[PDB]
Amino acid sequence: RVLKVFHYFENSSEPTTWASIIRHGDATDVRGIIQKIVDCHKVKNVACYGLRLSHLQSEEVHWLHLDMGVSNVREKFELAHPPEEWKYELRIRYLPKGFLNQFTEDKPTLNFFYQQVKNDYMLEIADQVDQEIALKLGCLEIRRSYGEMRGNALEKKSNYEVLEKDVGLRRFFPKSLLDSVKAKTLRKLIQQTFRQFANLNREESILKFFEILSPVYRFDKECFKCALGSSWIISVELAIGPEEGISYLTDKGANPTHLADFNQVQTIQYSNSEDKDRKGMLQLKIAGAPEPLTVTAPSLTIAENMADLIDGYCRLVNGATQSFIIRDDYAEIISTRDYEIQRERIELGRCIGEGQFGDVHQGIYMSPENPAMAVAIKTCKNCTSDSVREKFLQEALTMRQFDHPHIVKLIGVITENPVWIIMELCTLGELRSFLQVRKFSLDLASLILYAYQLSTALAYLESKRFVHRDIAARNVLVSATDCVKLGDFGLSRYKGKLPIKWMAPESINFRRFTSASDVWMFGVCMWEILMHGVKPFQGVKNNDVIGRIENGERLPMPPNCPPTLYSLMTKCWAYDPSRRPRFTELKAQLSTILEEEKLQ
Amino acid sequence: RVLKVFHYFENSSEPTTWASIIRHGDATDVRGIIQKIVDCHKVKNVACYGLRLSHLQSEEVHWLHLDMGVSNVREKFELAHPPEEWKYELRIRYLPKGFLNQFTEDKPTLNFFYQQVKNDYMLEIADQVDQEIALKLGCLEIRRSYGEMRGNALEKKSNYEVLEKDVGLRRFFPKSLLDSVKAKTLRKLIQQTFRQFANLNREESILKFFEILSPVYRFDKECFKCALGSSWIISVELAIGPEEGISYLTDKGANPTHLADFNQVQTIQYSNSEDKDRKGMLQLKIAGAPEPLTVTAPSLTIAENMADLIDGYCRLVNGATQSFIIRDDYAEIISTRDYEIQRERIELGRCIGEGQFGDVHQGIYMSPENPAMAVAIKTCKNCTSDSVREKFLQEALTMRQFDHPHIVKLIGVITENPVWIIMELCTLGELRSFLQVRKFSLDLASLILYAYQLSTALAYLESKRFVHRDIAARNVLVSATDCVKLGDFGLSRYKGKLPIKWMAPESINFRRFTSASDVWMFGVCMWEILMHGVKPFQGVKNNDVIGRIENGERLPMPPNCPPTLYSLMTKCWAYDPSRRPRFTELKAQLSTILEEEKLQ
């Protein structure tokens, strides 16, 4: 049985992309796997790093016990949700007393905990923190990453051009700050802050990083809510760490009133709550008392997590090896999820048209699972107005939640100015001019398949209920001679002109837009595609269009059109907009039509 | 157990890319699987199509018996070679008497056998055939593909522009012809030949296609060699088909002297030869004789194939269902190989430099396994000289036979003028200017890894023994900040100047080129990369270079160089070219060096 886990050993992959695959037997346990993981890099620690499981799209996690079976976990939890909704995480949870000291004598673990909790910082508090503290941490971090760099290194206009045009600091500084300061102001901030820590080293700036995290966050511990009392039971926030032993707060900045110490601990055991409330009990034994301390947490999950907490501090600061929780195996290093998008992995190509929001370009992206994917990049001329920004976001988030082949697929975004788009390229481009140039060359079966694929697509829209209102051949976009993907999906309000010849009477008259007008504009779409690209009513006004529809006048058949094909088109020409049939009907009909076409 | 087979039912995929996956149980047999395959498209035939297995990189095939287990085959043959060296092939082998008639009443099978043996034609005989016959078949084929197209359709300069700039006819006409005729001459050939069959249909031009294959190839049968005689044994070429029954030739164009007919057949059985010769025996029974006809083939393989031959004609033209070879299963439609490269799937991008053979461009390719891969495209200014053409081929075929990640990988070629290249893109480009611009920004660990990857690469060269002679930083080429792939691999002879400062003394003096100079130029490569791109001996002649080496003068260390790093560089600076150590030594050393670097 093989396994994938993200680790926090350094490589050239991204600072949050330190991954490996470990192959282990059923007998292998979380404690056993960590042995391999650490022996990959010669760490001085035997019973320190724990293992955390985690849901990708949620803040729920599960620290896990040692002797458990890997496959037993993978069962017990993947049976709940897919592996795209589970994630192992190798991590510290434990720290000896002067951990700065005990693992300043352990440099790999020094950098390990460093990168780890620095990450957690950038996750939770970077966008919150003071400007000044951010600059402190950031220039100490320059000193970290650049171990042999000069102290006058960043004194140059050239270097500034580097750091802005090449590096960029979404890795390092927060969105909150960087979208709050002038370019030149930010420069001189970084200057003055780079002056002072000009010549430290790793270990030095590392312990300074911890000193600066101290006032703003007590990473020595975690913070859990609970309510204690055998008999009258009393909410507290039992935040436990090596810095105190066992204590609790009655105010924010209080020194928590002390109870006991890890060295005083003797035993652990937990079970479900006394009742059907979704909670669990956790009895303990502390050194030399007749006296059980019993915490109760909002979940048996957290009951087990605090069981692991205490047992692992026992492993940590005592020589304890067995679990205090009274309830040839050998691993060798070998759909719907969160997407992270940076800027560095991008080609800045040539102009590929002139669009609605603005000009558009193509380029590349790189990633570990699949890389070097050249794409279209939908963009805008001006990003000054937040309304256009929001619609520019809205098309993206709209097309996000779909899951389909012949839907055109965004991959994600870079949400700083100039915000860009990752549209997997509509290669041959505008189906209109495409088929205009390819008039005397193409095959009606392929036209039937164009209609078929678009049928299945807009059918899936109705199955998940979105309305486009502006479907057009110029909005149809192409991948190949055997693939045309639905494109655009944008909102624009509110005057003239409008694609009247495409539109339905209800819309043309009083802005009514439903599945009826949807089927009608799909009808004109199928039509014009099947026309070899001939538009409706050449040289005619958009004014008489409504008059001639309400006169019942309809578009003539194409030359050499198939019977069933135009039959379905006329089914879609029900003057009663309500009566025009459904997209599932379009699917089944056009399906059987192409069946008989292939039958010839 | 699932399964993949290429079928010959039509789709929008390429004419030779008609593939499907079938999922079947162990109980499923080749005869049983074909039921699903045909019921996908409503064919009128129950016991007609056979199954052929085939090696990709060889002309060996294996027609297979009905009641055999699919997985039994997949075992019995994949245990011999990988699935990249095996291939199922659903095919006709059988034809009733006036098969043109019996399957002109079966239009799906009409087009099936049509496309099948037309393919085989384009495989074997298209490059051989007469000009005129080729044009005949090709314009009948225009009529085939274009079923509703006009008869005056290709009368236009415009259409000619279409067929040359968009379609192209490697699908349809041979290399031999198309690289034998002027563009305009070929045009008018196609014109005059398109005039005459201007208005047939499928079925008509189909049977004409068969009429034109008749004089040039007897597709009614296959042709096997054997030697017959119970007692004195006599080489013949027993080519059997429904057109004759059983016969044989004594000359090329002879009417083969007849022996027996399929209706006369009674039984089959085969076994190995009488002796250790790699052959097999095949006894038969024919209607109303005391008399065994015993063929002997060069292989038991072909013994079984002719057993299947006869038993399948029995199934064909008789109502026989059981095998005459006397020796809930249900399938549902769901490294190192031959590469086919066309032109249509290509982007024609912008200029991306100015190279040795000629200018160079980037672009895209599309394929079923992986598509839309944007790449570099190495090209040439002039393809007039066949020597430059051969070297342009030689670099390609050179880099073909490797198998490695950090070797730069061609994907293949289009071997008509202008012949092009598919280099998976060296993205960030020239490592020289790259690192020149990124001087004050980069990390020595990444430089160590540059050296490491190049070490492993040229080490693999030595493991498979190729010599480059011209390794340079300008020849080093980049993918990323964590990937640099070996590039170029070209031959150019034979005056000045030369990269003398890179080269070794033996070469500079008398054109000696071995692993010694290899290690030296790798040394200068590592050096200059580690220099932050500083070249050797600025403003110095290439003349005094040899004098100063033979004076023992060496390059100074870099500023802030690591000890072990320059130590290994000086190991490579052994003035005795023989004594400069090996690339496996470079691997192990630089490995442990980066180990200790990550250790810090």
PDB file of C-alpha atoms in Angstrom, chain A residues 10-13 40-42 107 111 146 148-150 156 158-159 162 166 202 345 347-348 350 362 364 366 371-374 425 427 437-438 440-442 446 449 479-482 560 595 597-600, chain B residues 10-13 40-42 107 146 148-150 156 158-159 162 166 202 345 347-348 350 362 364 366 371-374 425 427 437-438 440-442 444 446 449 479-482 560 595 597-600:
ATOM      1  CA  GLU A  10      13.033  22.023   1.883  1.00  0.00           C
ATOM      2  CA  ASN A  11      13.421  21.539  -1.862  1.00  0.00           C
ATOM      3  CA  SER A  12      13.254  23.666  -5.015  1.00  0.00           C
ATOM      4  CA  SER A  13       9.505  23.056  -5.243  1.00  0.00           C
ATOM      5  CA  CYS A  40      15.259  10.917   4.894  1.00  0.00           C
ATOM      6  CA  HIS A  41      17.076  13.930   6.388  1.00  0.00           C
ATOM      7  CA  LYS A  42      18.819  12.921   9.663  1.00  0.00           C
ATOM      8  CA  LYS A 107      19.069  22.810  12.855  1.00  0.00           C
ATOM      9  CA  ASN A 111      14.166  25.252  10.018  1.00  0.00           C
ATOM     10  CA  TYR A 146      19.476  34.423   1.273  1.00  0.00           C
ATOM     11  CA  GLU A 148      25.219  34.117   1.607  1.00  0.00           C
ATOM     12  CA  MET A 149      23.859  37.419   0.281  1.00  0.00           C
ATOM     13  CA  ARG A 150      25.382  40.793   1.033  1.00  0.00           C
ATOM     14  CA  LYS A 156      19.801  49.053  -5.881  1.00  0.00           C
ATOM     15  CA  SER A 158      18.184  47.138 -10.215  1.00  0.00           C
ATOM     16  CA  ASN A 159      17.404  44.841  -7.291  1.00  0.00           C
ATOM     17  CA  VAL A 162      14.182  42.289  -9.719  1.00  0.00           C
ATOM     18  CA  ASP A 166      10.541  38.679 -11.146  1.00  0.00           C
ATOM     19  CA  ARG A 202      19.777  31.645   9.729  1.00  0.00           C
ATOM     20  CA  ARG A 345       4.783  30.323 -13.945  1.00  0.00           C
ATOM     21  CA  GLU A 347       4.085  33.227 -20.374  1.00  0.00           C
ATOM     22  CA  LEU A 348       3.242  36.768 -21.455  1.00  0.00           C
ATOM     23  CA  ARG A 350       1.009  38.186 -27.989  1.00  0.00           C
ATOM     24  CA  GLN A 362      -2.349  33.662 -24.399  1.00  0.00           C
ATOM     25  CA  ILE A 364       1.437  29.166 -20.100  1.00  0.00           C
ATOM     26  CA  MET A 366       3.165  25.246 -14.674  1.00  0.00           C
ATOM     27  CA  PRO A 371       2.706  21.544 -16.275  1.00  0.00           C
ATOM     28  CA  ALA A 372       3.486  23.890 -19.180  1.00  0.00           C
ATOM     29  CA  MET A 373      -0.158  24.136 -20.251  1.00  0.00           C
ATOM     30  CA  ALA A 374      -0.507  26.915 -22.808  1.00  0.00           C
ATOM     31  CA  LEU A 425      -7.194  27.835 -24.855  1.00  0.00           C
ATOM     32  CA  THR A 427      -7.464  27.235 -29.985  1.00  0.00           C
ATOM     33  CA  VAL A 437     -13.200  30.410 -44.323  1.00  0.00           C
ATOM     34  CA  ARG A 438     -13.868  26.652 -44.171  1.00  0.00           C
ATOM     35  CA  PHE A 440     -16.427  24.510 -49.069  1.00  0.00           C
ATOM     36  CA  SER A 441     -14.563  21.940 -47.009  1.00  0.00           C
ATOM     37  CA  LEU A 442     -16.562  20.618 -44.061  1.00  0.00           C
ATOM     38  CA  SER A 446     -19.436  17.259 -37.890  1.00  0.00           C
ATOM     39  CA  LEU A 449     -21.879  16.848 -33.689  1.00  0.00           C
ATOM     40  CA  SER A 479     -10.808  23.799 -29.686  1.00  0.00           C
ATOM     41  CA  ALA A 480     -10.650  21.536 -32.719  1.00  0.00           C
ATOM     42  CA  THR A 481     -12.428  19.930 -35.633  1.00  0.00           C
ATOM     43  CA  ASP A 482     -13.933  17.622 -32.989  1.00  0.00           C
ATOM     44  CA  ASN A 560     -29.370  20.423 -48.430  1.00  0.00           C
ATOM     45  CA  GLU A 595     -26.987   7.596 -34.811  1.00  0.00           C
ATOM     46  CA  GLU A 597     -26.353   9.656 -39.780  1.00  0.00           C
ATOM     47  CA  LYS A 598     -23.503   7.326 -38.880  1.00  0.00           C
ATOM     48  CA  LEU A 599     -25.796   4.550 -40.080  1.00  0.00           C
ATOM     49  CA  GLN A 600     -26.067   6.503 -43.353  1.00  0.00           C
TER      50      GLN A 600
ATOM     51  CA  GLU B  10     -15.946   5.946 -37.999  1.00  0.00           C
ATOM     52  CA  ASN B  11     -15.752   8.964 -35.703  1.00  0.00           C
ATOM     53  CA  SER B  12     -14.274  12.471 -35.772  1.00  0.00           C
ATOM     54  CA  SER B  13     -10.983  11.125 -34.415  1.00  0.00           C
ATOM     55  CA  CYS B  40     -22.341  -0.765 -30.828  1.00  0.00           C
ATOM     56  CA  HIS B  41     -23.278  -0.043 -34.463  1.00  0.00           C
ATOM     57  CA  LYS B  42     -25.851  -2.622 -35.692  1.00  0.00           C
ATOM     58  CA  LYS B 107     -23.337  -0.760 -45.604  1.00  0.00           C
ATOM     59  CA  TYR B 146     -17.557  14.168 -49.201  1.00  0.00           C
ATOM     60  CA  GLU B 148     -23.013  15.689 -50.246  1.00  0.00           C
ATOM     61  CA  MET B 149     -20.387  17.805 -52.015  1.00  0.00           C
ATOM     62  CA  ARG B 150     -20.789  19.204 -55.501  1.00  0.00           C
ATOM     63  CA  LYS B 156     -11.524  26.748 -57.606  1.00  0.00           C
ATOM     64  CA  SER B 158      -9.855  28.938 -53.425  1.00  0.00           C
ATOM     65  CA  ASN B 159     -10.475  25.225 -52.910  1.00  0.00           C
ATOM     66  CA  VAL B 162      -7.908  25.009 -48.891  1.00  0.00           C
ATOM     67  CA  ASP B 166      -5.508  23.352 -44.441  1.00  0.00           C
ATOM     68  CA  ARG B 202     -20.393   6.020 -51.409  1.00  0.00           C
ATOM     69  CA  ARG B 345      -2.504  19.994 -34.925  1.00  0.00           C
ATOM     70  CA  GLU B 347       0.354  26.384 -33.809  1.00  0.00           C
ATOM     71  CA  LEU B 348       2.538  28.580 -36.007  1.00  0.00           C
ATOM     72  CA  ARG B 350       6.325  33.876 -33.305  1.00  0.00           C
ATOM     73  CA  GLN B 362       7.197  27.747 -30.793  1.00  0.00           C
ATOM     74  CA  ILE B 364       1.362  23.450 -30.076  1.00  0.00           C
ATOM     75  CA  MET B 366      -2.596  17.783 -30.023  1.00  0.00           C
ATOM     76  CA  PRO B 371      -3.124  17.298 -26.028  1.00  0.00           C
ATOM     77  CA  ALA B 372      -2.491  21.018 -26.594  1.00  0.00           C
ATOM     78  CA  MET B 373       1.153  20.789 -25.521  1.00  0.00           C
ATOM     79  CA  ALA B 374       2.907  24.032 -26.407  1.00  0.00           C
ATOM     80  CA  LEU B 425       9.770  23.887 -24.783  1.00  0.00           C
ATOM     81  CA  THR B 427      10.796  27.778 -21.535  1.00  0.00           C
ATOM     82  CA  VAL B 437      19.898  39.147 -15.495  1.00  0.00           C
ATOM     83  CA  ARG B 438      19.210  37.115 -12.336  1.00  0.00           C
ATOM     84  CA  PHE B 440      21.777  39.353  -7.485  1.00  0.00           C
ATOM     85  CA  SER B 441      18.793  37.125  -6.806  1.00  0.00           C
ATOM     86  CA  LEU B 442      19.622  33.418  -6.873  1.00  0.00           C
ATOM     87  CA  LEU B 444      23.755  28.570  -4.411  1.00  0.00           C
ATOM     88  CA  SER B 446      19.949  25.835  -6.779  1.00  0.00           C
ATOM     89  CA  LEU B 449      21.257  21.348  -8.170  1.00  0.00           C
ATOM     90  CA  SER B 479      12.653  24.868 -18.195  1.00  0.00           C
ATOM     91  CA  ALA B 480      12.319  26.423 -14.757  1.00  0.00           C
ATOM     92  CA  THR B 481      13.969  27.520 -11.546  1.00  0.00           C
ATOM     93  CA  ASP B 482      14.067  23.790 -10.733  1.00  0.00           C
ATOM     94  CA  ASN B 560      32.189  32.638  -1.907  1.00  0.00           C
ATOM     95  CA  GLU B 595      23.037  16.419   1.076  1.00  0.00           C
ATOM     96  CA  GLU B 597      24.101  21.672   1.862  1.00  0.00           C
ATOM     97  CA  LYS B 598      20.515  20.843   2.758  1.00  0.00           C
ATOM     98  CA  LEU B 599      21.914  19.824   6.136  1.00  0.00           C
ATOM     99  CA  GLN B 600      23.452  23.319   6.295  1.00  0.00           C
TER     100      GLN B 600
END
